[model samples]
Target: SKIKEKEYAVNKDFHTPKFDVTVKRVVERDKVGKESIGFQKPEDGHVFIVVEAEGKNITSEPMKLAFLPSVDLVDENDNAYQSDVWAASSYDVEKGETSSITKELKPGEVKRQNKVYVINKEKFDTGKWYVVVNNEYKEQIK
Candidate 1:
């Protein structure tokens, strides 16, 4: 129900009662996906921030309607924050297409997905970025 460490490094695993999650990477981009094909651009003065992560069900029973935990962008003081994009699509290199992050996980099943968001260029430039997953697991994006 609880993890020993309140904060974890990128790519390190952390546990919750229902799942084990790891943040793989964080990236900043003006555009996402293939150059000539399906791609997305952020609104002017905003940029895309992707938080790639993995989540594995740790319970004995399959997790249905398993909402992947919230991944928020927080400032150093934990004052200013931006919630991630609700319907953000992650580009798959193998498929060469974007995909959703939501899924069903059977016991011990693991899924890797990306949490994407957009924020002001000023915030991205000035804020000290931290990712808070499930409201428990925290990691600095830098």
Candidate 2:
């Protein structure tokens, strides 16, 4: 399909002559029972959030997979980047111990991730947020 603003789903050859990729619903997150998410309780100031992403590989070569966040929550006065230190559990997932990723994607492979990012509730952001979910793909990650 065609790319559009506010459009989380995009499919393209994506700088690849052989593989096309798809992405959806960038970064974003809530709520009570929030105390159970991070190491601290929400009542004390930490915020709990849920994030999920899915990507499909449309090539024959196995693709290496890694998840990274490279955006900031930008407001009228500040830009808060993604919280790096997060807990294993979120509000939805009870299986907190098996958090990991695919080392490599097989042909026609699909990869997905769901995790929580606990931010300083008082400092994250009030306006739109950007996670650098840009398609400017690079081969190496650090």
Candidate 3:
């Protein structure tokens, strides 16, 4: 008896991967400041990335909370590329360990900030394209 092979259907829809790093803790001091956030990285000791969140506008009397400049790594098509980076608790900042400050912000005010740290560049090559915070891929695609 001859067995018949069934044809399988394949979908070629394009889907972009989304990665988010949230701010968990924040610390400020006279000399050095520090922050902690959530991150996802790959294993193999090849990729090392760090993310920090901070508040802006502390000098003003009215203390306005603003988003700190963020960092990211993207692809030529402006897509969030995956890397072999990981976040570890061991990477703690000692010089700045005073997480006790609450700044009020108004509507539409950005209080959270994010900073991306690339520990290993060899494994985390940016190639020709680069990454930016909250960059819309649709806009880039256009």
Candidate 4:
């Protein structure tokens, strides 16, 4: 099978929010679980951030969605964490708890949800962490 090359990344709607929005980089919190009921929330030492998107005509393409591989969570200390659908699904089962998640999107279309949660802050081999926002972002992580 041959996968064609893609040219505009970031497309969708309805966890992460597809389309356009200043797109802020990961910002750890004063606290977690306190803000949202559905999310397991980052523990005192842990952290969280939405991870998503890539490549031209990306919106028109199928996204090749693989929840886990979708986003890259890596730290300078040699620790890496990707979105794990299985892990995300299990914890957000509380009374108003619901994780933001999405699969694909149409070209220039919008409405999305796809956030990444770093379950273990302690696992952060590198005291500092950064999200690999598509391939370019990966440079920051590596």
Candidate 5:
């Protein structure tokens, strides 16, 4: 059987790799079943989002992950360089809360995962969110 492999490309204009990560929003509600939107108040609830990338040779090197709250504000053709109307989170794929790597593939094997916290609903609601994975901002891999 042929081994599974994956390939990813960096945005030519922004010089950053791109991946299609999924987005989800979690909300807290009161006994009356009304959604609360505000600060980290007990009544205000929270939001959780997870991103995952799988396959082999997705990239030759580790990439940084950035979250944009709104999609309308970003250029779909070139998101890496454009300033996110609302930059939500900037994290390294390696440092993500959940991640995995496979060694059975070629030297350029690739895999990714992401977990983000949204304590505030105002910012999330204001921007239509999207995710960006790039090769900028380095930190000790955890």
Candidate 6:
């Protein structure tokens, strides 16, 4: 199997087919706009959940890494919440370069990419949340 287990803790490494990846940390924001970087505000009653993910290319050659690994936020019932594609943003953690959906990864290179998700404020406040990767691996975000 590509993923060793169904769930992992944040910052813990989990292997994908091409890289070892982890959700470094999570950030909550009321809005991301001019005060920040021209990003849009969340919809009514919704807030932003920014997931900062890190992935390292383990191979000796270049590979392509998607900004997200089919990620989603899920509740106890497994109701999946997908990220806002238009709101999705990323940058090379060390290089300090903004990225496209698929960024080229250098051999043994590590990159940090982030994705933004909008969810109901009430839902977030009242329940437990977890990050689901590749539709398989899960990590709790607290």
List model 1 lDDT by residue over 1-142, tens digit each. Answer: 2321122237777787888887776767676666555666778888777666777888898785356565566767785355344425434542343455445788888886566667777777776878888888667775
The sequence of per-residue lDDT tens digits that candidate 3 reaches over residues 1-142 is: 1421111121112221222223332211111123444334433433333333333333334433333333344445455544222222323332233253356543323343323333334333433433344443211110
For candidate 4, write residues 1-142 as lDDT tens digits: 1422111233331132232322233433322232344335455665454444332223444442342123455667646666645433433332134646455544554432235555554454345555554333343421
* lDDT at position 85, candidate 3: 24
Q: What residue runs in model 2 are displaced by over 4 Å at the alpha carbon?
A: 1-43, 67-92, 95-101, 122-125, 134-142
Cα lDDT tens digits, model 6, 1-142, are 2421122247767777778777766666665444334446777878777776778888788887653356667877789876675565421222244544446888888876566778877787678888877776888774
Judged by TM-score, which candidate is best?
A: 1
Q: lDDT of all the models against the reference?
A: 0.66, 0.41, 0.33, 0.40, 0.29, 0.66
> Between candidates 4 and 6, which one is better according to TM-score?
6
What are the per-residue Cα lDDT tens digits for candidate 5 across 39-117?
2212253332223233333354543333312211122233332321121123332234233343344434333332333
Shift of residue 6 alpha carbon in model 2, Å? 18
Give the lowest summed-lDDT range of ten residues in model 3: 4-13
Indicate whether candidate 1 or candidate 5 has the larger TM-score. 1
- How should the candidates be ordered by TM-score, best one leading? 1, 6, 2, 4, 3, 5
Residue 134, model 3: lDDT of: 41
Q: List the residue pairs that clash in candidate 1.
A: none
- Candidate 5 Cα errors over 4 Å, as ranges: 1-43, 58-105, 135-142
State model 4's lDDT. Answer: 0.40
lDDT value, residue 96 of candidate 1: 46
